Amino acid sequence: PFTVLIEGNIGSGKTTYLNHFEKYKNDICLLTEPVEKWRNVNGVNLLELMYKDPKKWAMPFQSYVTLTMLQSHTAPTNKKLKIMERSIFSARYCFVENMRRNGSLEQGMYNTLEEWYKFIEESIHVQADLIIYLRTSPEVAYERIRQRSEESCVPLKYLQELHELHEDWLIHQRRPKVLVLD
Amino acid sequence: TQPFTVLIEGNIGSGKTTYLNHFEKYKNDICLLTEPVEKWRNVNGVNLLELMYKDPKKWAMPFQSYVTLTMLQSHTAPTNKKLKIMERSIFSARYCFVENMRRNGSLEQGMYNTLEEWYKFIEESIHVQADLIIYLRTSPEVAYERIRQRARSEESCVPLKYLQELHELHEDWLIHQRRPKVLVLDADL
Ligand SMILES: Nc1ccn([C@@H]2O[C@H](CO)[C@@H](O)C2(F)F)c(=O)n1
Ligand SMILES: Nc1ccn([C@@H]2O[C@H](CO)[C@@H](O)C2(F)F)c(=O)n1
């Protein structure tokens, strides 16, 4: 099916934007970021644990993120258009890269996650037809986060870092059709 | 797309490498798959096996994640041969090795739960071919001696206690069963 990925920083407006599509649920496969799964891995909130102790929990959290995303990407649909919030690509190019850069993933941990990504991309073609990038400034992103969880103590520098990674990927073509919304 | 497949299972020091070498003269008809130790030793220059033995609380989860991946790659590896024989499996990883790291505290609940979600999704996504298991049944002490009598490597300091627990887990799975056809070989010889 035709596949659209909604990408953007934390606090870039994706959840509000996606709520619009909650009424097209019989023409469109609407796959919202599985944060509820991440908050409840048979009683364990991996999202909370990662934010609390990244050096310990970034690895298993991102591994579980990789799996949930992989599930969403490969889920069957009759609908002729699929819309997904985030992807295995942003997990890899932005989130995992940043955790490597900031030291939360030691080399062997980074390497394990990379081998999974390589294996997935060799075993299957993941459908990405269109990327919609909700582009924001880290300041704007920071303020959405504060005007509304586990993530509320993200520093601005962390948002700045995730911002440039999205810019590198989606504007400057430093990683592998992109529509840039404001 | 997979041939009749035999998995060779046993404790560390149960004689699996020696046993598997007997099938090398039959490589015309047998796809022979050694446990992917060489991969684990060199994950883009990182030895995950050594790191796991050095500090299991830190490295058990990424190590067993990569083990899963490499076993998956062996299970699914393409062959024209009539028979595939594999050293260990995604089953011993899950039911023995991960189970013991969970019990001894190297894997916390969330870490264990992540690996289990992977195993669940793998068994929903593919049928892993497993037609026969050959269990090399040894006593922990003989396994222990075997390890101590051979070249120094990452596992050379595994305690007898660790071996004893792995033994009971192999017994749970392959004898009591207890876990979801086994030929039992006396490998204490
Ligand atoms: N690959 C990913 C994807 C998402 N997240 C985090 O999940 C929360 C909800 O989007 C956000 O707090 C978050 F974006 F930071 C993450 O840490 N890594
Ligand atoms: N799932 C698995 C499979 C194997 N191993 C370990 O790998 C080494 C070589 O057999 C042995 O030291 C070993 F068997 F312990 C492991 O830790 N976890």
Say whether B84 sits in a helix, a strand or coil: strand
Beta-sheet strand order (sheet of A28-31): A28-31, A81-85, A2-7, A130-134, A178-181
Q: How many angstroms separate the CA atoms of A10 and B134, rounded?
A: 51
Cα distances from B157 to residues B16, B51, B154, in angstroms, run: 19, 13, 8
Helix axes A156-170, A138-146, angle to 10 degrees: 130
Is A67 close to B118, i.e. CB distance below 8 A? yes
Catalytic: which of B9, B24, B38, B87?
Answer: B87
* Nearest atom (ligand 1) to Cα of A149: 12
From residue A169, how far is each of A165, B137, B165, B188 by CA, in Å?
A: 6, 53, 48, 57
Does A85 participate in catalysis according to the annotation? yes
Q: Domain B1-189 adopts which CATH fold?
A: Rossmann fold (3.40.50)
Ranges of beta strands (E only) in B27-177 are: 30-33, 83-87, 132-137
Which residues, 6+ apart, have CB-to-CB distance to B60 below 8 Å? Answer: B52, B101, B106, B107, B111
CA distances for A119 relative to A3, A70, A146, B24, B68, angstroms: 21, 12, 38, 28, 12
Beta-strand (E) ranges in A96-144? 130-134
Determine how many CB atoms are found less than 10 A away from the CB of residue A49.
21
CA B114 – CA B117 distance, rounded (Å): 5
Query: A80 CA distance to ligand 2 centroid (A)?
Result: 46
How many whole angstroms separate alpha carbon B148 and alpha carbon B164? 15
Please tell me the distance from the alpha carbon of residue B46 to that of residue A148, in angstroms, as a whole number.
42
- DSSP annotation of B172: I
3-state SS class at B52: helix
Architecture in CATH for domain A1-182:
3-Layer(aba) Sandwich (3.40)
Taking the CA of B61 as reference, the closest ligand is 2
- Contact (CB<8Å) B110/A71: no
Both structure tokens of A80: 């002729």
Give, as one character, the DSSP assignment of residue B43: B
Q: For residues B186 and B52, is the Cβ–Cβ distance under 8 A?
A: no
Residue nearest to atom 2 of ligand 1 (CA): A91
Q: Which value, to the nearest 10 degrees, does the dihedral of the CA atoms of residues A83, A112, B68, A69 take?
A: -10
Q: What amino acid is encoded at B188 in this protein?
A: D
**Closest residue to atom 1 of ligand 1, CA basis:** A91
Residues with CB under 6 A from ligand 2: B 12, 35, 37, 67, 88, 93, 97, 155
Q: Does A76 touch chain B (CB under 8 A)?
A: no
